[model samples]
Target: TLSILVAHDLQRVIGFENQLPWHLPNDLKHVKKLSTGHTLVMGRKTFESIGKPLPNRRNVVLTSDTSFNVEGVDVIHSIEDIYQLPGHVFIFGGQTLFEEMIDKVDDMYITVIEGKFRGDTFFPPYTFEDWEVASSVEGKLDEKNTIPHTFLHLIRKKLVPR
Candidate 1:
């Protein structure tokens, strides 16, 4: 399943200072579980934010800067290259990359955090007009972890217009 996986707050705060804005241990695990064995499709800045290639997955980076290279990962200069990759791929990204590629996938995993936040970079605006919820799991807010959240597995309807 080639999909886009993102965790954002009510305000769409996916990033701050090139990294995730909040610390929700469960959400972090939620990401790892879904994307662990698949391909990680990301931009240069997103690749850098994680600091290195994720250990278990294939890191395919989309970047225009030809001079950049990192061991243990594949770098391509255009978005088209990602289209031919075999098997499942996860769009784990920086904002620009995600915004551009969102339309190409049929599935999206969205973690909706229940709170207001402050962040510089944000997840692109998306809608459910073409999607139907496949499944949803609600997460809780507690002392150890203080934000309520929900995990949604949304499947896009591509065959017919909404």
Candidate 2:
């Protein structure tokens, strides 16, 4: 099954100029903990934002550019290729990638970050009306992280059998 892990501001802004607008170390730690030892699928822009392969996780990049490649990373040229991958998969990424996979996600881990920030990229328009909030927690703030954030886990509601 596929899942999504993302962080966005109140306005649903996820990034500006292809990079995160805020500094939240705890959120990063949260991501690493959940996605570690699992396959992480991302688009090329997301990979570019990260700059390097994330340690202790399997990194896969989705891009149409056949020549696109990076050391210690597997590059696939299509979105359909992700399903063939084995084990747990997390759609980690930029706008298009998130939008394409949101409907297929079994669950989602969202970090709702507080404050207003300028951004060009946004989380896809999903109401989560069909999903259930499995857990919600207020994140602690420190000198390194000034913005208040909430970590939420959402599980997609199962369809009723006829």
Per-prediction TM-score to the true structure, in the order listed: 0.92, 0.95
Candidate 1 has which clashing residue pairs, if any?
none
lDDT of 1 by residue, 33-74 (tens): 888878988999988888889878788999898888899898
In candidate 1, how many Å is residue 45 off?
Answer: 0.8
Candidate closest to the true structure, highest TM-score = 2
Off by over 4 Å in 1: 140-143, 159-162
The numbered model that scores best in lDDT is 2
Clashing pairs in 2: none
Please give, for residues 46-159, the per-residue lDDT of candidate 2 as tens digits. 999999999988999999898887998999998889999999899998899988988888999999998788999998877667889999999999999889999989999888
Q: What do the candidate models score in CA lDDT, each in turn?
A: 0.86, 0.91
Clash count for each candidate, listed in order shown: 0, 0
CA lDDT for candidate 2: 0.91
